[PDB]
Amino acid sequence: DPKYADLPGIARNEPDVYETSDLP
Amino acid sequence: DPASGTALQEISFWLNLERALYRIQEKRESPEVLLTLDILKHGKRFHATVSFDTDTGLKQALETVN
Amino acid sequence: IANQPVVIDNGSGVIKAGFAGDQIPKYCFPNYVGRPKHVRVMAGALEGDIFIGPKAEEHRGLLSIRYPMEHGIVKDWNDMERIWQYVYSKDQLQTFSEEHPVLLTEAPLNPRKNRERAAEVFFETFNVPALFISMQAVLSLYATGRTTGVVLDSGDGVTHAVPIYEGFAMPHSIMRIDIAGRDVSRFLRLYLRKEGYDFHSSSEFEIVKAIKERACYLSINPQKDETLETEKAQYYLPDGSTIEIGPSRFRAPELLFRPDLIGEESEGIHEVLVFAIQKSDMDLRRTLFSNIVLSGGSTLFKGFGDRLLSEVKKLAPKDVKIRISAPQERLYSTWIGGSILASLDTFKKMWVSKKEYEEDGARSIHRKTF
Amino acid sequence: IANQPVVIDNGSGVIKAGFAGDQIPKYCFPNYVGRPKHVRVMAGALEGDIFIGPKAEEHRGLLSIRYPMEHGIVKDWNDMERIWQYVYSKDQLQTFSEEHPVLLTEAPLNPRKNRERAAEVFFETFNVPALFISMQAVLSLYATGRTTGVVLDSGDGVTHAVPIYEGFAMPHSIMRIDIAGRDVSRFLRLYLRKEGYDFHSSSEFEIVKAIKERACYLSINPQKDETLETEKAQYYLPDGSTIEIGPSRFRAPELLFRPDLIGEESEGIHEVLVFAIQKSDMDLRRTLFSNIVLSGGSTLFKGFGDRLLSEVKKLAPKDVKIRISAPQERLYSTWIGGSILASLDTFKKMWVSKKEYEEDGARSIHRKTF
Amino acid sequence: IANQPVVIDNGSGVIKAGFAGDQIPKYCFPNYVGRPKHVRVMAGALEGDIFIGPKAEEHRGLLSIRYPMEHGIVKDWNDMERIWQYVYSKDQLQTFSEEHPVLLTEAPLNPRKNRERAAEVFFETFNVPALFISMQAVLSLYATGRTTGVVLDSGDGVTHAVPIYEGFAMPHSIMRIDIAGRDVSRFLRLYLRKEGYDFHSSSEFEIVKAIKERACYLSINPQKDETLETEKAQYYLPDGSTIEIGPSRFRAPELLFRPDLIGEESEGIHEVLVFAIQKSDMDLRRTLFSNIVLSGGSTLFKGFGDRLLSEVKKLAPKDVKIRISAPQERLYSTWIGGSILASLDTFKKMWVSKKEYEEDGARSIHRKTF
Amino acid sequence: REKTRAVQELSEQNQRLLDQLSRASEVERQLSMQVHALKEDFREKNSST
Amino acid sequence: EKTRAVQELSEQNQRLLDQLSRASEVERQLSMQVHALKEDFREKNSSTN
């Protein structure tokens, strides 16, 4: 998105949610 | 301020606040109106959603009215 | 009076600003004051003595940069006054200081004197109509569209974890440690001295900051990667030189997870997050583990959150769902959230009156600090 | 003005209420007032400063719990008023406090002031048309079909024994000790401290209750498991921690059978019942030994029936048949009995009108106490 | 055959020692373990890798101090083995553990694992012939020579009250909260961080303790003195600098009477004493309010007992004589009483012999807890 | 009834006097705040001079 | 009960009248003291002028 391009530093191409797997 | 006017005007506008905010709540409770906020929340334009959930005095208004 | 209020994030290394009701900070420039260290002879040279702003990066080979804010605490108050006036300058905002409510941010648990002196500046030099100082965490929750979470940020100089549950902040569970971006860059500078590059000037230090933001990356198991040689990235200096980094490209941001490397008994960032959770109650631990919100520029390291999951998972209880949300606008979460809170009427019912400040002083802001 | 009287089981551990004629109490929320502990910073947080029932059970960690009623005696009238207001609120009944008769139970042998102030609240703050105060023994007999029996209830705060024969209560044989579920939970807390697990907050006190209800049993013998030093069964906490217990999941509930452990000379629950039977008339012993009714939540422990039988069997004279009727509605027996009694028409004659109280006062309540 | 027993008085912050029959604990040293932080390079440096005793205080800046006994519960058994060996080392006692009986002191209401592991340590590592774990209140009564009294002590990590009337202890009226000197020191570290002074190093915590033990007093009226901006007294350092403490020198010791400042809901020290007396009998309250005996290190603040008298008057019934008897030996009262207890004749039969421990095991020490 | 009449009169007139004296106290409290600010002004006058 | 109501109404109203007179008259004292400080500040400022 352009709003997240116009700025100097942005996490481009990175997963946004870090979470443990299933199988509790 | 109920220092002026008649008591009838007061009773009538309290009742009018009831039915008015009542219908306003009916408007808000519709799924499309909420769906717009859902789209905004999906687009992360949190200004509108947060301002709509806290700046609208509808909560305290419905409380004090009821 | 109440015109469109102004949000200013005093990032200890990059100050972010703009008006409220906006959607992005259009005024982002690093936090320092660069004065020239050379001799003026040719008439028609650069303009002015101080060089705050983008002109600094444009002419960094002349300046002698000085940081005003070290570890969130202001040392050179005159520099912060010059920077704040530069925020109201003709190149940044053009408004007048007597026209807008100011939403200033602050790192948590900063000394009382810092707030007091900031109040003096904004109500004596600048004559603002209103002022409010808040935590940086709450703003990130506003910008991330949530209400419960543990904001674990890493600015350029202060990393901390504030666990907020349903809008209620738990002050006794706040953990703050002064080891962030500048220490990562400083440690990297020491490593380049041992690699034979001797960066010691001020402009050289900001080149180190550019390296840290571009060539470093975090580890997964520093021993698995320590026993094996790595990529050895080839970064090009603006001069045209060539530098190699080697294993220090992953050894440099290890300082965050382990301050023993810099010789400092403190906690890792993982220990800060885990302790901040465990300092709180018991009914909330599971929900706080499920909602970890990052922010702060020093969490943009590549391969960071994955190591954070392995670390916290190694520390948190068995099979608890740890869920870290890291958005793309982490760098401006505090600003965006400042815009969100400042675009409300509760903000009008939340700042500090100029008259009330004149009548009271420091006690006013320390009462309305939350 | 009356339509479906409101039955209220004013119990110190959990308040059970609903309308008359309802076979089951619709609302059974715990009896405590939850106030927040952590300051609200973020706007749009939880609303209000008083959390009751379902809300103060989900956001338990954020709260500090203050029990209003302790040992069947109200301490803060404000809190009880708020709980009763919660009962008539929108989320619970949506009724007015002027359109329904109110049956509010009470433990026996309570001071007169509780009756006086309870009616003052229900006749001044609430303009209740009809109020009737009862015993928490007769109602269990109603909800169990019997008319002759020994009601041995053990609520969370006060246990007692009332021998009722053919609808006639023998008030001088009422035995009552103030040692119940609260003391068991509190003593369980002390056992966890001796086992290395402390709990001091009020919000974590309910986790002690949770342990009690999910892991405590009663051994048939006090020494066949004492010196055995059995296994340590684990039990998970709400966060994901782990508690192994061992000698406390049976040592804590023996406080009911012998309160010498708490440091208070009194009689155990078995001595309460046996002394309540032996204080009655000579001819009425066999019918009372064969008609024992259980009620109250503390009579739900594992092995409670076997222990109660063996203790009474030791204290009763030889070969006397001892039957202990233990219904499955021990928590709601008193309420169901209230729903039965208020659904009758003799209740119309048994209550107190508003003008009756206005012309008389407390005297009218002590007149219709039985 | 038997010899003069050793009184190994524990403590959460200071461990006292000395043989029985003495009058002064000749070997006192802090209960912390110091190991080097930096890297040994030269040949002829300090050797040992673990430093306990005055040597650790001599090289505080070189050691990473860490306490192994937190809130009366031993957290590191290996470090405690090192500490107890240092007690029997050639610098403090110069004797053998196989030739002397041990009088160990423990705080009341401690977990059973501490007693059991202490038994295994003193009977499997040290081949002590006889061990007797005693309380701490009774010992201070022995030291003062009295027979009745409410011993209100306040160690480094545990404040507790044990009312004892005519030599008889009441094991159900014993209050115990884990909020004391070490926690007040941590709270003072927090206030100095709020004043603009960093003390994040663990070896610097000793400096924080020195600040607490030297420039802190208890104000009688708390908020009345909080409003008055004091002179901001200047205190030196073990560096040579100067710190302006200010208001954080009177509200830092207010944690003892207000545990809400640490965010933990519990009782105050005054509430501990009053509740420990109210939880006892009815005919035993005037004598218990009279004989109030203090002990522990934390009861040495300026105006401690004066504020204690004020608070007790606010909680005790009207017109009751109160005598907070604070002797000048409050720091070593438990050791003096241990010398008196071990120097008697019945002490021969009070302990647990080695053969007894070999026969029963932990059961023997659990039977002789009082 | 006359007891309640005369005492409602006494209590209400005494709380009216409470209103008057409370107004005077609040006015001078604002006056205290005002001369706090005025002293600060004169402090800046002495400082500039 | 009515005479006790006489008691409490008189007690509360009159005591608060006394407390209000204490705070008000103490600030009147503060006003005269502060007026002396006003005179001192005008003297120092006018002298430097």
Ligand SMILES: Nc1ncnc2c1ncn2[C@@H]1O[C@H](COP(=O)(O)OP(=O)(O)O)[C@@H](O)[C@H]1O
């Ligand atoms: N892409 C990146 N990789 C690693 N570090 C970065 C990156 N971008 C920014 N940073 C670090 O973030 C810092 C910016 O600090 P910042 O988080 O903005 O402080 P604040 O958030 O308080 O304004 C920079 O100094 C830099 O060290």
Ligand SMILES: Nc1ncnc2c1ncn2[C@@H]1O[C@H](COP(=O)(O)OP(=O)(O)O)[C@@H](O)[C@H]1O
């Ligand atoms: N399943 C269970 N097993 C054992 N004890 C229970 C169980 N459920 C509840 N309790 C205990 O019994 C109490 C129930 O309260 P109750 O007996 O209804 O008190 P009251 O009669 O005053 O309302 C609870 O507070 C808890 O202490």
Ligand SMILES: Nc1ncnc2c1ncn2[C@@H]1O[C@H](COP(=O)(O)OP(=O)(O)O)[C@@H](O)[C@H]1O
């Ligand atoms: N002179 C003093 N003034 C105030 N506090 C003191 C003083 N001396 C010691 N303390 C506090 O008392 C603690 C030591 O108390 P002590 O009685 O040794 O506890 P314990 O016996 O449980 O180790 C120290 O941690 C210190 O915080």
